[PDB]
Nucleic acid binder design. Structure first.
Lengths: 95, 554, 340, 95, 348, 338
DNA sequence: CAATGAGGCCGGGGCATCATGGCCCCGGAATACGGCTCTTTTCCG
DNA sequence: CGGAAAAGAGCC
DNA sequence: CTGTGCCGTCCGTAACGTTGTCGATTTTTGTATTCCGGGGCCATGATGCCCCGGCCTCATTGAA
DNA sequence: GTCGTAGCTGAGGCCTCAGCTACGACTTTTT
């Protein structure tokens, strides 16, 4: 029982970008320019705005939080006009 | 003679789907776009709008894959616009695209589509080609579903060829489909009014849930007397004093109004006309001064009905007798449920309710229009003396209503300014929406045509002054939208400031979408959809489909 | 008559109201004046400017001002909330119920068109070298048929002789070409007016004729009359029966020579054509060059509908229209149809 | 009965941006950097990918289509970290 | 009883069979890189366990974080031969682990349970026979002569008088069953996959089908380590499986009940799913070996069935195979606390 | 073998031949001799290969892990059947009250005997002679006689419970050859929950430092460092360290705090009497931990046979003898009193 | 001028909705074996 | 009345 | 005057070549227990609305 | 396969706006 999410990072400090990226690449897969794709359930979501409320000042950095459905039927809700969008799912990295 | 021309093939498929459907389509125009028909074009204009190879006049050995070719066989009685043809040498195959998956029907093709390929083949057979079968290409799945021209499919085709001519020439439109699930998909019910008519034509039906309003925006207000309107593409940027005050999305802008010296750029006007979007100029105070047309609302049968019925004083008299009585009934309904006193007066007096609707029976027994006229004005009058009392529990500071400063140009009472405006802008709503149904508001059965006020936009406004225009005045006074400080004086009479003029307009805008129930048809109905349902049946009663008129007495 | 419309050709022009006057300013400099005295429907071009005061003034005097592109390409009108033309609308509906109104005017249109056709036959007769003159027997037979048209007993009769009158004139339509047959320009006297044009010359006529219905319907709608409520043509089924009712005499004067003009100058050529199983269509290079011929014909000035003041074809369209609205409501009887 | 949407325009041609912007500002209100907010029901949605399938080449321009719920209860589903997100609703422009 | 709480689990293990991984702590990212080229990655949140098949590389910084997130890394040999493991300064409860010292130093409950393990092994070696005997004619079901013979090592196991006779009960039960395992696979051994159940028990494999069991069980033991490193148990004190180096002696004891369900059923799918072609193998360098191409198929494969939901007999509450592992383990420490007198078994 | 220590957190550890030869940057620097080898101390970010590791995991040779200063990240254990035996031996002998008390009595004399060594030789409060009073010196000799037969772990407690507070009523007389200003031990508690003295700021921080190694040196072999004979475990007691740090309880933890102030390095201003006894500065804490190192690397000899080594290598040698006394070859556990 | 029923309102019975109090559980904070013996400065006789 | 234990004290 | 086409002009994408290097718990340890408090939860309470019909007012057809 | 990785600087690629100069769309009837 999960949710997929996306992020729309329009951050207004490179330091904040890194700690974003650091924690945000640590959070979501680099999806589009200002965008990662995110896969977060009950728990760690709270740890983004935990991480990303210091990762940002809330004055200038602007991001929409892109909080999506239960991550099992999300392909209807996507139109990635160029490069296709793709979640990363519950698999064990085998190599 | 020229009484019946060649039938387009797109008009034959609809014939076997519904007759009331088809007569409306084929005989003339007024079409819109739905779930299936917006998809009807989007698939098409990318592939089927673009033409291809010409059909060879001398065919020996070559692929026929023509596209967008117009046939017209003068013997069969029909004209075509073929989607595509797949042919080798001289045996062509009618090829028509569709919208959905393979239907869960035997053969994967519904009957109207089966007739489509066959007659198209019959037309292809007409110009010297061998078709003997067609196909259905579901571009959604590209699942080519072939069909063979079985003889009875020709038989239905010719049978469908002949009945449509008999029906259209007759000019009497067939009854609605009997509670058909085609109605939800037909996209006619709001203009079909099937079980509107069905229940109204004594084929007494019980409403299922209807196929109900979508696909329209809300009008545009420009009350600013120094606004400068210009195009931002399909954005319409409202700049006033050279700064973008608001932006109007053309795709969802339904109506255009101009109050006082408000300016719009020419190319913007070039745009608005393109989308049959009305531009209703009004003076700075709500006098409906002018309007626009684009080589006219093309429907004539309703027009001829109305004139022929308007040339009939009985229809002028019968209809007018229902108008004011529907008006007066809502007056008592308005006075009573809004009735607001302190003690032993918190009810409407039977004495008051004696004579307001004693006019009804006199109006019911009005022998003609003129006696009908005096009964209204007296009933309107006796309504007005009792109108003042129902604002703010008694007139507020300066918010005092006068019955006899009513019905005259320069409103020299503030709330009589308020009543002046509410009627002033609202008659347009009849004038605008009744226009869309192809009717004529200046050819009045009841009222008389004169400049500035349409003789039927007046006629149909009779019932709806209390519900809409009269009530909004009370509430705007009552809730505090309008008070005396909202009023400024002038040479003419009582007038309102810009700020309150927004305030009454937007709340007036809000009165327009409020859901109520039709007394006859018992459904959640907004006011923006009260009037247009009302306009439609008039054509039908003018056509005589409905034996009588639903007065919408609430 | 009452007055004439004012054509504000310039897209740059800035049009104001000077009390009674309708002033035209180009760069704040006066261009001309209408004085709104001899005025009618006002024509404006793309992104031109009309001040509201002049706008309202025309709407105050119930002038039906239209809107035209910079090319003059039409958009639409602007009508007031006046009873100026609903009366015409209610007469036209009420008078269309009259056979005489139908039969008389139908006869009036048929006789005008027959005269104009043979008037052309004696104008552009192009038998150079041996046949400088048209056959008087052809001319007299046309003179015979118009008499029959003048004395048409019923509608099914007038149409048949009209269609018969058309065919025999078109039997010689191929004759007034560049001197002989226009090889590569096929013209059949029989496959005319069928929905796919089966000839290149049929195509030129069909395209020119179609651009008349749009010419007339807007000219018709300029006055408060219905282009779809006709006396002589069948009204229903998407056909504006009234403009077609009046355009009948002017297929010769507005359309037929247009094919001849564009063909005898070599503008229309067989490479400008495409054939498709009974479809003879132009190129858009030809189509938009063909329309350019139409405007060149529409700008020529003709003097005498009933009054001699050298008006263009398109500004004569209204002149006929307003005169018709005066036969309606009974101002000038018999509709003094303009025929050449 | 409507839906709100958003757009994530990471377009790879300025011409396409304009005809995007032109049609996209004509479509959605400029919401964030690569972002407009969009409000589209049954109908005109089809007219975006109509407009935006020429507005873009599908190779290089990349946008996620951000197709949202019935536009009446969308405030739960928003966290616009800086500048707050706001739909434009069914009102008549009054001035 | 009432082991009310089943372990839910936020994450799942990570796998590295490639001998040239390079696994990166990028804050939360446990990225993997391959010859300076990433192949995949893992946020540290969703990761439950880590295993290194043979030489799989790593950074102590990741170890530092992996220990910082207390995630069990198992340095393994290439055939999944369990050779390294880590525990975070042991389990903090002695009272739990002291249950077993006294219980292990006690022999009776060992025999009381060592019985109940291959009795639980034979009881469901046999049920897999009815489930995985690929018989086609007069053969669609397993031979009752074989089935009753399993009912005999069944009772012979259940009446083990010592803890070495019980061993012989299993081996013949292995000898016999695996004699019959040759029909467990695609209508009986088809493409070169002849089940030489005699090369069963051999340190290196000769056989295709005898090169697969020895890793799944070599894996089987591996999860038991963490699966028993969970409830506070320590898988080195074998009741009857004497500690061998690399052999977690008691992790070896408790897989008898589910020896058939978890390896005897997965082998009989990959085969019966055409994953086991004798050409999918490194046919030598051990007499018989295999390739990562199919290895990557089975390791994820062995993971998936491990997340199949079945009930537990006591409450019928369906719990996935990883999640049922801890449930049966709680029955121990409580039976090791003596809380449950009997030991419920979930023989299938 | 000697437990090899990877010194600088920068080098490279590798297995060439049968030798875990460590290397700095492309240079061989030391040889391990796996045949007689022991735990390898992996400091902050110094690492070994997953072939030396995958060989050490094979041979039941431990691989331990340390931070930069030396702080312990978790270990890496071999899944052998050698280390558990000692743990089984540990756990088999743990519940044996005899060897428990047999173990138990052996430390308490080692702790008591070593105490009078710290006095009198690092008693320097002469006055007339700093030689610990002969009646005072014989009391422990009597107490060691008490220790020879303490017929219970509760009698052992009462003996040591007596034997503890008394020489904390004499600690100042070894401190400064007198009383350092502030650094005069209140003849009182040992900073149990709170510190209560400048001494009590050094005499639970240091013990907390000693409790470290007597746990790591015990997991360094197959011994669960958390199951003790003397101290009864109470769900979190490093009793095995506690029961067995006792001989070095004075020998390192008190010579360090003494020569932390015997040479005068630590004064009153270094610590702040904040919410307790005192609270040392980190620089003071750094010097104390550095001072801890001076005692920690102080040379020593003969754990059981003549060999001079550091205290670390001494601090590990006991447990192997312990396991060797856990049913190993040693039948009588050496006590190593100085 | 007077009839048998429409229109509509008054006018409440019905009940969901919220929010606070009752209860239960849980958690921490503190006190008490519970409980031995060796040793060490104000007392009782 | 000083011893001297014994009490009770600090604590373990 | 409505684009749209540059024309730039900053700000919003990433990734990377330097030298930081970092960083380390914390003031023990007797225990076990019980009770008391807090918090949450749960249940019940009343209240507000919407609804519906009786009742009123009162057509208007019926009736003299 | 040498400490490895965190953190900072450049060079290029997206994204938008303000400020300029061209221009001057509109096409039969049908799907």
């Amino acid at each position: 029982m999960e949710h997929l999410y996306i992020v729309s990072y329009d951050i207004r400090n490179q330091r904040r970008w890194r700690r974003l990226f650091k924690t945000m690449h640590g959070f979501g897969c680099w999806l589009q320019l200002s965008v990662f794709q995110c896969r977060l359930d009950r728990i760690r979501i709270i740890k983004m705005e935990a991480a990303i409320n210091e990762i940002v000042n809330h004055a200038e950095d602007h991001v929409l939080i892109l909080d999506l459905g239960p991550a099992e039927n999300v392909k209807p809700k996507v139109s990635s006009i160029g490069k296709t969008f793709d979640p990363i799912l519950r698999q064990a990295v085998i190599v | 003679d020229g009484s019946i021309p060649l039938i387009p093939v797109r008009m034959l498929n609809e014939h076997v789907y519904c007759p009331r459907l088809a007569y409306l389509m084929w005989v003339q125009g007024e079409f819109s776009h739905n779930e299936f028909t917006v998809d009807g074009v989007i698939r098409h204009r990318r592939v089927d709008a673009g033409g291809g190879v010409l059909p060879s006049e001398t065919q020996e050995d070559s692929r026929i894959h023509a596209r967008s070719v117009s046939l017209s066989s003068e013997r069969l009685g029909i004209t075509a616009k073929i989607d595509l043809v797949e042919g080798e040498g001289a045996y062509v195959s009618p090829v028509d695209y569709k919208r959905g998956k393979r239907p869960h029907v035997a053969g994967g093709a519904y009957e109207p589509e089966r007739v489509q390929l066959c007659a198209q083949g019959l037309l292809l057979r007409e110009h010297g080609f061998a078709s003997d079968g067609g196909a259905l290409y579901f571009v959604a799945s590209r699942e080519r579903v072939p069909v063979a021209f079985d003889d009875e499919l020709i038989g239905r085709t010719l049978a469908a060829i002949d009945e449509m001519g008999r029906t259209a020439l007759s000019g009497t439109m067939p009854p609605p489909l009997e509670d058909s699930p085609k109605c939800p998909r037909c996209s006619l019910v709001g203009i079909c009014l099937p079980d509107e008519v069905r229940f109204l034509s004594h084929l007494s039906v019980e409403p299922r849930p209807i196929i109900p309003a979508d696909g329209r925006g809300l009008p545009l207000y420009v009350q600013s007397p120094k606004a400068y309107v210009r195009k931002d593409g399909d954005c319409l940027v409202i700049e006033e004093e050279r700064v973008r005050v608001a932006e109007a999305r053309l795709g969802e802008t339904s109506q255009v109004a101009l109050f006082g010296n408000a300016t719009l750029t020419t190319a913007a006007l070039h745009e608005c006309l393109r989308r049959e979007i009305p531009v209703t100029w009004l003076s700075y105070g709500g006098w409906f001064m002018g309007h626009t047309v684009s080589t006219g609302h093309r429907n004539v049968e309703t027009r001829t009905y109305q004139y022929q019925r308007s040339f009939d004083p009985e229809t002028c008299l019968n209809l007018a007798r229902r108008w004011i009585v529907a008006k007066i009934a809502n007056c008592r309904t308005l006075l009573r449920r809004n009735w607001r006193g302190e003690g032993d007066e918190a009810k409407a007096p039977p004495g008051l309710l004696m004579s307001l609707q004693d006019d009804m029976r006199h109006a019911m027994r009005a022998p003609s229009l003129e006696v009908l006229l005096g009964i209204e004005g007296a009933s309107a009058g006796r309504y007005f003396q009792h109108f003042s009392r129902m604002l703010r529990g008694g007139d507020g500071e300066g918010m005092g209503f006068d019955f006899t400063t009513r019905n005259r140009r320069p409103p020299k009472d503030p709330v009589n300014a308020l009543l002046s405006f509410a009627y002033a802008m609202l008659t347009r709503e009849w004038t605008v929406a009744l226009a869309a149904v192809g009717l004529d508001p200046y050819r009045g059965f009841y009222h008389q045509p004169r400049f500035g006020r349409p003789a039927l936009a007046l006629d149909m406004m009779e019932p709806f002054r209390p519900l809409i225009a009269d009530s909004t005045v009370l509430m705007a006074i009552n809730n505090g939208e309008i008070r005396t400080g909202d009023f400024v004086r002038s040479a003419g009479g009582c007038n309102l400031t810009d700020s309150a003029r927004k305030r009454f307009i937007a709340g007036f805008e809000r009165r327009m979408e409020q859901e109520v129930t039709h007394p006859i048809f018992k459904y959640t109905i907004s006011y923006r959809r009260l009037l247009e349902v009302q306009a439609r049946l008039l054509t039908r009663y003018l056509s005589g489909e409905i034996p009588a008129y639903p007065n919408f007495v609430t | 008559g009452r007055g004439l419309p004012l054509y504000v050709q310039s897209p740059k022009a800035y049009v104001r109201k000077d009390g009674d006057c309708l002033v035209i300013e180009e760069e704040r400099v006066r261009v001309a004046e209408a004085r709104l005295g001899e005025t009618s429907q006002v024509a404006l071009f793309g992104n031109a400017t009309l001040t509201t005061a002049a706008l309202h003034e025309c709407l105050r005097r119930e002038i039906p001002v239209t809107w035209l592109s910079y090319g003059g390409w039409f958009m639409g009108h602007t009508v007031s909330t006046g009873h100026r033309n609903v009366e015409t609308r209610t007469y036209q509906y009420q008078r269309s119920f009259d056979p005489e109104t139908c039969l008389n005017l139908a006869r009036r249109w048929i006789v005008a068109k027959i005269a104009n056709c043979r008037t052309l036959l004696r104008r552009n007769w192009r038998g150079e070298g041996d046949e400088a003159k048209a056959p008087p027997g052809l001319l007299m037979s046309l003179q015979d048929d118009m008499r029959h048209a003048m004395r048409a007993p019923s509608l099914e009769v007038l149409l048949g002789i009209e269609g018969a009158s058309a065919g025999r004139y078109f039997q010689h339509f191929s004759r007034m070409l560049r001197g002989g047959d226009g090889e590569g320009m096929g013209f059949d006297f029989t496959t005319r007016n069928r929905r796919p044009p089966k000839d290149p010359v049929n195509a030129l006529l069909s395209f020119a004729y179609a651009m008349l219905t749009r010419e007339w319907t807007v000219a018709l709608a300029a006055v408060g009359l219905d282009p779809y409520r006709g006396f002589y043509h069948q009204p229903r089924f998407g056909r504006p029966a009234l403009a077609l009712d009046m355009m009948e005499p002017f297929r010769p004067l507005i359309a037929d020579s247009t094919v001849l003009m564009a063909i005898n100058n070599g503008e229309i050529r067989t490479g400008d054509f495409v054939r498709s199983a009974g479809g003879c269509n132009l190129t858009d290079s030809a189509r938009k060059r063909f329309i350019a011929g139409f405007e060149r014909r529409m700008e020529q000035e003709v003097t005498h509908p009933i009054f001699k003041y050298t008006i263009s074809y398109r500004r004569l369209l209204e002149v006929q229209a307003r005169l018709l609205t005066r036969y309606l409501s009974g101002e000038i009887p018999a509709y003094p149809n303009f025929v050449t």
